[PDB]
Design a protein around this ligand. Structure first.
Ligand SMILES: *CC(=O)[C@H](CCCC)n1cc([C@@](C)(NCc2ccc3ncccc3c2)C(C)C)nn1
Length: 215
């Protein structure tokens, strides 16, 4: 694979968002991945609606959590592949309460046909990401609250508790790293991003990687 990749260099990644006090990280991880995959299939970059998942995907648990893989499955099996625009279905769960689903009057921003669950191996995930784009991952983020910047070497790596988006890596750096988009505003971390050391399963990053498939 290339020594380094950063999909932000192509304009493939939307701006950092804010999940607020809702346990909706699963939705931000899944939607961020769909946004990037939609752009990379040769279509324009479009902000898509976490709130569609939080309120309407009844196979997940709203502000009480979910699974990116369930989200991808709901989109295909229950929503005809469709993902609405953020522009047409804005986030409304910042206080921790998910409002009931609105089915009407949103606008379709993207479609997907399925998803893949990637091998539990950082080199294999990197190789897939280098060609196919950003990848949704679960991590242990219990040690992340106080992170401000640099390449994390000390991640507490015990229990998956958070969903984020891998957008790149750099194997040529003094400490090789992953580049991860979070959903905790641009005030957190490196303008909303974190770098973690690559190659030692930091934060359990290899354990539950997946992506939407766009035709
Ligand atoms: C990150 C975040 O906002 C929440 C924290 C918990 C909610 C207060 N989060 C964590 C997850 C993970 C770990 N999945 C847990 C989970 C919760 C509910 C649920 N419902 C149905 C099926 C499966 C579920 C799993 C996720 C990052 C892998 N999700 N939200």
């Amino acid at each position: 694979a290339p020594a380094a990749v950063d999909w932000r260099a192509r304009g493939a990644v939307t701006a950092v968002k804010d999940q607020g006090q809702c346990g909706s990280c699963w939705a931000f991880s899944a939607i961020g991945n769909v946004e990037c995959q939609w752009f990379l299939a040769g279509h324009p970059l479009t902000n898509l609606a976490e709130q569609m998942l939080v309120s309407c995907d009844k196979t997940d648990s709203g502000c009480s959590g979910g699974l990116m893989n369930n989200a991808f499955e709901w989109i295909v099996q229950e929503n005809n592949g469709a993902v609405y625009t953020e522009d047409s279905y804005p986030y409304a769960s910042g206080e921790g309460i998910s409002p009931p689903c609105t089915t009407s009057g949103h606008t379709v921003g993207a479609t997907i046909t399925g998803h893949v669950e990637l091998p539990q191996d950082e080199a294999q995930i990197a190789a897939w990401l280098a060609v196919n784009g950003p990848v949704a991952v679960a991590v242990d983020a219990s040690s992340w609250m106080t992170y401000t910047g640099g390449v994390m070497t000390s991640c507490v790596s015990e229990q998956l508790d958070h969903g984020v988006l891998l957008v790149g890596y750099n194997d040529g750096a003094a400490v090789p790293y992953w580049i991860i988009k979070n959903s905790w505003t641009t005030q957190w971390g490196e303008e909303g991003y974190i770098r973690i050391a690559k190659g030692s399963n930091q934060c359990l990053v290899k354990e539950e990687a997946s992506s939407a498939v766009v035709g």
